Amino acid sequence: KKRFEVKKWNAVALWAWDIVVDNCAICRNHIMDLCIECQANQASAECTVAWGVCNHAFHFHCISRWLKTRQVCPLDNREWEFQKYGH
């Protein structure tokens, strides 16, 4: 019996793949950090993220190299399709 009370509510959740906000799967550096190639060859002359319609995320540089052997997602095996390149 108070002044403010909930009559109705609309919650929203955006889902991702469980594990943990952990590193790249193809490579292995944190998804938010440099990748096998950058963090190693950043000795002279940007490892960002890319998503798949399958909601899986890797470093754009790691999933691009992999797609050349086969155009599928490393984790599941569905045809691959970039969903987003934005961070």
Partner: protein
């Protein structure tokens, strides 16, 4: 007119979103108008801009249930396929409606599965969408929810697991809203509030007539300063209203002027005024523009357009290079403009920057005796 691609995306949103304009038009009026915009698209150089802002607007509209016509809204996907937009862009658009359809089935499956019990079952709606396609920001806005809503989190969570394993939910409260009952001392009203507004107001529940400082609200709400400032502003300064739900201490004309010591209190005399006469009962929507695009989100969207540009310009240059093994700057610019034809128009400066980046990265090299002509290598 609106030549600027972004003005055109906003305009489109103004017609597909529930708005003063969306209301002053019939399906046909809207429809025809939406087409007299897509037509003008064939004269826009940077089409990637419209595409990105249109998609960002669509996202809010479907996540917030603010489409004026589910019909027109969906038929827009074909109208875009007609004017020539890429099948990849249009297809991911169609993918969003599918995602919503899948979300609403999962909504009911929950509402019934859970007729047993925090709240009157049906009064609670849920929307669960994939992050990769519905998230536009890397920024997360945190909010500590009042127990009266936190007891739901674990409920919705278990239900989702036994449906889909190996998944994780990330609460997007910024996009959450609802209706609450405000029991005044003049009456009781139903306020259509934002979840952040909700959290803010519920701070007075075990202390109705107490004054609370900004700093203490920040502690009880756990909202980031920026969000807390505008949320509070919408409660002590909702435009045109004659009586504010909340009252604050040192008066100001901008949420920027609030300081740690500003005190807030629940106005025990709040009421709607329908017919110049106090109304003991009623309903009002105080969400306002709290869940619409912010300046920050814009800079985010532009950064995204810039990321893709650079990437798409690098790929196009190499490609043209992986074909001719030697080409003149002049020639490169022009057949490069052609490949990016349906996305945007790279300016000379960006091209030089990329070309430059390509030289130092060892993919190409200038001519031995010519500051222009480039030679593919590797």
């Amino acid at each position: 007119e609106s030549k600027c691609p972004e003005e055109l995306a906003n305009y489109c949103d103004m017609l597909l979103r529930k708005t003063p304009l969306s209301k002053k038009l019939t399906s046909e009026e809207i429809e025809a108008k939406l087409k007299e915009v897509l037509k003008k698209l064939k004269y826009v150089q940077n089409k990637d801009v419209f595409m990105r802002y249109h998609k960002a607007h669509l996202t809010r509209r479907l996540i917030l249930d603010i489409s004026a016509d589910s019909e027109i809204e969906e038929n827009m996907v074909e109208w875009l396929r007609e004017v020539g937009m890429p099948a990849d862009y249009v297809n991911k658009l169609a993918r969003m409606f599918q995602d919503i359809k899948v979300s609403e089935d999962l909504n009911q499956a929950f509402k019934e599965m859970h007729k047993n019990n925090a709240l009157p079952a049906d009064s609670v709606n849920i929307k669960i969408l994939n992050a990769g396609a519905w998230s536009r920001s890397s920024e997360k806005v945190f909010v500590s929810l009042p127990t009266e809503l936190e007891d739901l989190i674990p409920e919705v969570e278990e239900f989702y697991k036994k449906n889909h394993s190996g998944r994780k939910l990330h609460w997007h409260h910024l996009m959450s809203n609802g209706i609450i009952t405000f029991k005044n001392e003049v009456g009781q009203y139903d306020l259509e509030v934002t979840t952040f507004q909700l959290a803010v107001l519920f701070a007075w529940n075990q202390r109705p007539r107490e004054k609370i400082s900004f700093e203490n609200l920040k502690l009880a709400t756990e909202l980031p300063d920026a969000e807390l400032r505008r949320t509070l502003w919408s409660l002590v300064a909702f435009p045109k209203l004659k009586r504010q739900v909340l009252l604050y201490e040192p008066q100001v004309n901008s949420p920027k002027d609030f300081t740690e010591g500003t005190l807030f209190s629940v106005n025990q005399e709040f009421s709607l005024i329908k017919n110049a006469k106090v109304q003991k009962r009623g309903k009002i929507n105080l969400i306002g523009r709290l869940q619409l695009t912010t300046e920050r989100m814009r800079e985010e969207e532009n950064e995204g357009i810039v990321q893709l540009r650079i990437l798409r310009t690098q790929e196009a240059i190499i490609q043209i290079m992986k074909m001719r093994k030697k080409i003149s700057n002049a020639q490169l610019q022009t057949e490069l403009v052609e490949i990016l034809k349906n996305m945007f128009l790279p300016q000379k400066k960006m091209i030089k920057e990329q070309i430059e980046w390509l030289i130092e990265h060892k993919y190409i090299r200038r001519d031995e005796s010519d500051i222009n002509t480039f030679i593919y290598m590797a």
